Design an enzyme around this catalytic site. Structure first.
Site, PDB file in Angstrom:
ATOM      1  N   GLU A 271      -2.292   6.183  -5.632  1.00  0.00           N
ATOM      2  CA  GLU A 271      -2.285   5.245  -4.688  1.00  0.00           C
ATOM      3  C   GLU A 271      -2.273   3.761  -5.088  1.00  0.00           C
ATOM      4  O   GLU A 271      -2.978   3.680  -6.385  1.00  0.00           O
ATOM      5  CB  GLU A 271      -3.697   5.358  -3.817  1.00  0.00           C
ATOM      6  CG  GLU A 271      -3.850   4.307  -2.895  1.00  0.00           C
ATOM      7  CD  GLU A 271      -4.631   4.741  -1.715  1.00  0.00           C
ATOM      8  OE1 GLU A 271      -5.204   3.790  -0.726  1.00  0.00           O
ATOM      9  OE2 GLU A 271      -5.362   5.940  -1.524  1.00  0.00           O
TER      10      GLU A 271
ATOM     11  N   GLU B 294      -9.899  11.753   6.329  1.00  0.00           N
ATOM     12  CA  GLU B 294      -9.109  11.298   4.977  1.00  0.00           C
ATOM     13  C   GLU B 294     -10.155  11.406   3.953  1.00  0.00           C
ATOM     14  O   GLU B 294     -11.119  10.772   4.132  1.00  0.00           O
ATOM     15  CB  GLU B 294      -8.616   9.901   5.199  1.00  0.00           C
ATOM     16  CG  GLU B 294      -7.791   9.702   3.955  1.00  0.00           C
ATOM     17  CD  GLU B 294      -7.046   8.438   3.798  1.00  0.00           C
ATOM     18  OE1 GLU B 294      -7.731   7.544   4.595  1.00  0.00           O
ATOM     19  OE2 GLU B 294      -5.747   8.425   3.600  1.00  0.00           O
TER      20      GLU B 294
ATOM     21  N   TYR C  43      -6.752  14.286  -2.818  1.00  0.00           N
ATOM     22  CA  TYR C  43      -6.594  13.565  -1.452  1.00  0.00           C
ATOM     23  C   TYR C  43      -6.045  14.361  -0.434  1.00  0.00           C
ATOM     24  O   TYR C  43      -4.929  15.221  -0.474  1.00  0.00           O
ATOM     25  CB  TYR C  43      -5.646  12.372  -1.800  1.00  0.00           C
ATOM     26  CG  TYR C  43      -5.183  11.564  -0.619  1.00  0.00           C
ATOM     27  CD1 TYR C  43      -5.918  10.784   0.021  1.00  0.00           C
ATOM     28  CD2 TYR C  43      -3.859  11.688   0.000  1.00  0.00           C
ATOM     29  CE1 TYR C  43      -5.346   9.926   1.086  1.00  0.00           C
ATOM     30  CE2 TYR C  43      -3.399  11.090   1.035  1.00  0.00           C
ATOM     31  CZ  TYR C  43      -4.276  10.129   1.585  1.00  0.00           C
ATOM     32  OH  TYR C  43      -3.963   9.497   2.858  1.00  0.00           O
TER      33      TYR C  43
ATOM     34  N   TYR D 216     -11.084  11.870  -0.225  1.00  0.00           N
ATOM     35  CA  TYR D 216     -10.811  11.376  -1.538  1.00  0.00           C
ATOM     36  C   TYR D 216     -11.785  11.731  -2.990  1.00  0.00           C
ATOM     37  O   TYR D 216     -13.234  11.700  -2.611  1.00  0.00           O
ATOM     38  CB  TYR D 216     -10.816   9.802  -1.734  1.00  0.00           C
ATOM     39  CG  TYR D 216      -9.918   9.174  -0.862  1.00  0.00           C
ATOM     40  CD1 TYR D 216     -10.251   8.944   0.231  1.00  0.00           C
ATOM     41  CD2 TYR D 216      -8.724   8.606  -1.839  1.00  0.00           C
ATOM     42  CE1 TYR D 216      -9.216   7.891   1.014  1.00  0.00           C
ATOM     43  CE2 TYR D 216      -8.100   7.861  -0.960  1.00  0.00           C
ATOM     44  CZ  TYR D 216      -8.182   7.479   0.438  1.00  0.00           C
ATOM     45  OH  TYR D 216      -7.198   6.879   1.041  1.00  0.00           O
TER      46      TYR D 216
ATOM     47  N   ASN E 274       0.778  -1.181   0.247  1.00  0.00           N
ATOM     48  CA  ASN E 274      -0.190   0.261   0.052  1.00  0.00           C
ATOM     49  C   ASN E 274       0.874   1.195   0.065  1.00  0.00           C
ATOM     50  O   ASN E 274       1.988   1.255   0.832  1.00  0.00           O
ATOM     51  CB  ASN E 274      -1.119  -0.160   1.202  1.00  0.00           C
ATOM     52  CG  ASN E 274      -2.038   1.000   1.042  1.00  0.00           C
ATOM     53  OD1 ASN E 274      -2.673   1.585   1.901  1.00  0.00           O
ATOM     54  ND2 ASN E 274      -2.574   1.227  -0.436  1.00  0.00           N
TER      55      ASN E 274
END
Ligand SMILES: [Cl-]
Ligand SMILES: [Cl-]
Ligand SMILES: [Cl-]
Ligand SMILES: [Cl-]
Ligand SMILES: [Cl-]
Ligand SMILES: [Cl-]
Ligand SMILES: [Cl-]
Length: 194
Positions: A177, A87, A78, A89, A46
């Site tokens: 990502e 967080e 992001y 997105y 990740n």
């Protein structure tokens, strides 16, 4: 050019940048002129890496370039907020895995229709170390690499749907990502407050 292979944040040619990996496989980011960055990854665990701004806010982000995942990757505006810790997105592209959670309705922005989702992570990596936080998602109904993201449209629609953003204390980046996958990106970002 500056090659980045280690968790850091920094500045580069006017832009904030951010690179995070959990250590898996081989992952690199190359920082070039102005808004440009490339990434290359092989069998990652990740990672998240990109260029943008030390602080989120309502701007019109312009970006272009290429985004070629083999398996699971995201292309997303992001960042994070504090008080509360979120967080967030705005996803314009992905591979074999479309992000999903509790559906909240849609928002139309920058020529596309975005599905809005909320999920939660427990005791996960964060800008404030191991933490529990909500994730806010806008996911375009069709893949593209390039155009304008009007962040204000996404923030306003999250707000209308019960998703309150905290303070813009943390970075806002045009992110590549990857999860258990391989690929490359080559992206140029710019933008300006609305
Ligand atoms: Cl794909
Ligand atoms: Cl749902
Ligand atoms: Cl669309
Ligand atoms: Cl598509
Ligand atoms: Cl594409
Ligand atoms: Cl656009
Ligand atoms: Cl792979």
């Amino acid at each position: 050019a500056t090659v980045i292979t280690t968790n850091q944040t920094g500045t580069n040619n006017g832009f904030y940048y951010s690179f995070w990996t959990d250590g898996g496989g081989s992952v690199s980011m190359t920082l070039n002129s102005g808004g440009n960055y490339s990434t290359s990854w092989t069998n990652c665990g990740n990672f998240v890496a990109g260029k943008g701004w030390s602080n989120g806010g309502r701007r019109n982000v312009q970006y272009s370039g290429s985004f070629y995942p083999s398996g699971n990757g995201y292309l997303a505006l992001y960042g994070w907020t504090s008080n509360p810790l979120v967080e967030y997105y705005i996803v314009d592209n992905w591979g074999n895995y479309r992000p999903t959670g509790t559906y909240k309705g849609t928002v139309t922005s920058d020529g596309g229709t975005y599905d809005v989702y909320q999920t939660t992570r427990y005791n996960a990596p964060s800008v404030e170390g191991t933490k529990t936080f909500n994730q806010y998602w806008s996911v375009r109904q069709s893949k593209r690499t390039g155009g304008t993201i009007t962040t204000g449209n996404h923030f306003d629609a999250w707000a209308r749907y019960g998703m309150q953003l905290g303070s813009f204390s943390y970075y806002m980046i045009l992110a590549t990502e990857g999860y258990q996958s391989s690929g490359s990106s080559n992206l140029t970002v710019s933008g300006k407050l609305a």
